[model samples]
Target: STAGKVIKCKAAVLWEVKKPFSIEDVEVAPPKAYEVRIKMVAVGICRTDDHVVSGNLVTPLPVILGHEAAGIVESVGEGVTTVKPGDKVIPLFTPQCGKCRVCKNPESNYCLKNDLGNPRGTLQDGTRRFTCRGKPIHHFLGTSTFSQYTVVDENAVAKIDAASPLEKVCLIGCGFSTGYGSAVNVAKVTPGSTCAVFGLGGVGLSAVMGCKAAGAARIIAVDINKDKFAKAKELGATECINPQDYKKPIQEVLKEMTDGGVDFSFEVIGRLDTMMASLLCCHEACGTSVIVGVPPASQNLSINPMLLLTGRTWKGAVYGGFKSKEGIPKLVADFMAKKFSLDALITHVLPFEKINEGFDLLHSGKSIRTVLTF
Candidate 1:
């Protein structure tokens, strides 16, 4: 057993923002108490990971950059009972410690122990498990799955069905579930309703699928890139629109098309302008809008306070409001049952060593998602 031993493995380490990822040899320490050591099988290059690289979002530097991944448990630390060796699992950026008050609330998924607010670079004990060249490296969102091996708190992982494909279903860890569940769970897109999705990235396309499954009458997809429209339609978008084609503001165009704007709207590009547009692009008095993107850390959106007075509900969710430990497994089960397809959102797949190339795909907006297989 490799338990209690330090393992030498390769990791794509980001030394600074806008720095190249150097895949280098690193030491992965064994799990501490209530922790898990995972042998990463597959990971996806999510936009959030790139946000740090782009300097739009900030997390501590000298960290392994990845979170959307699936892996097998290599070992468990003391008192770890939820998952054990060989278990198929997905790492959670949002943790669900069952004892948290938010966990006890059946309506909410924001666990009190989550690092989303404070954004810790270390684990439960405030120390990192990764080291490279005699220097300690930070963990990215507690699930640094960019490495061959990584450690995470037990609460920050969810065990999924062994029948789940490690490579394909890894998208469920973040992109797929975040957008899909946002429509189904947060916005609650109803049948015969109208929905508009801003941006045609992986998450936006997933929202389209969710809208279709929810029976949205007209699913309007927006993007500057016309290339993503084909896949958008393939995944159930009723119409794809390019903002560049319209002279007027997008919200005004949407309002005219839907008679009084759509019943539901989702902003997925993480832009402040789109955030305001999503809020304004819904039905005046009875529509719902959800912000599904991650904007730059220092940026803020200013809106007229009267926007909410008309009864338009504007909200957002992390991980699409899925309660990690319990919900992810069921989502994985549904994926196995052919309820929906994750393959539609994956445009590229490459080996983990080609991580830099995958990031380039994201920067150029040429890829919806690039899964890295170990």
Candidate 2:
């Protein structure tokens, strides 16, 4: 069949904030020009998804939510040539439109055409393909993998090796890459450096691994949840700290532990307090702090300007500073080569029907990554 045919599929729909997603049969419209229809096989639950569902991030109502995903291309619209039917692929929330100014720059991977400003919950052309109860549903981050089937722009999908397992590789679509790359790509962590990670979740743990891969002398993992400490150590963290165990703030604790601060620090937790601490816990001079978490839309962070003046550099990392199309495929290749690990980060694999329970596991902080399979 050509691209313009409509297909019916099951999708988890978010009708309102702070509400459970309703499993509903929805219609997925055909891909328009430069779009591709995807048959989603697996999707990794991300904290960002939970943030959106909890009313932390502003998005259109009745939207389909999941983003970290892998699938097979079912069809391609006109002008879509990068991938074809039967191609194993991962959808990118941060699209790589190579011709755009941002994509052309090596320092950035942001594509203006794929910006997440869709107030009406439509595609770049301002129209949606999903409908439930006869009311149009909006799209989330242009790659709504919560649905069994989705339509994504051709520029936003990366074709992967056919032999790669969708369930395992789906993680590279978001958390894994964001964490691993933040250390290796954005922060450029160096050998013999002392590193500090401000969260032990998938992203933070991955950052720990990246630091180890970069040959860091010491990798410190901080979290309120001590349950994740063991895994953090197994992955790469040389030291693990539960902030609640100490009377002093985590930043001060880290400073005392590292003798003035770590050479590199990552704020993988979205809390503003942690972000500031991540900055303050950096080495007095030449220490770099990278913010890898997505905070709420209205959230604003303030820091002591003296931190920067004293030579502590703080910056933000999106998609781990990876150029979606170019970098994601290499990551999959590395995974296939067994250069890094994903199995440890995935704590639960649940069927799509148990997605709500998966969210519960995430909230409980017991699961590092809960991947939903269709």
Q: List the residue pairs that clash in candidate 2.
A: none
TM-score, prediction 1: 0.98
Q: Report, for every candidate in turn, its global Cα lDDT versus the true structure.
A: 0.91, 0.90
The count of residue-pair clashes in candidate 2 stands at 0
Mind sharing the TM-score for model 2?
Answer: 0.97
Model 1 misplaced stretches (Cα beyond 4 Å): none
Candidate 2 residue-wise lDDT, 39-155, digit = tens: 999999999999888887788888999889999999988899999999999999888989989988879987887746444566768789899999999998888899999999888
After superposing candidate 2 on the true structure, give the runs of residues whose Cα lies further than 4 Å from its correct spot. 1-3, 117-120
Q: What's the residue-level lDDT of 115 in candidate 1?
A: 67
Per residue, candidate 1 scores C-alpha lDDT tens digits across 209-293 of 8899899999999999999999999999999999899999999999999999999999999999999988899998988999999
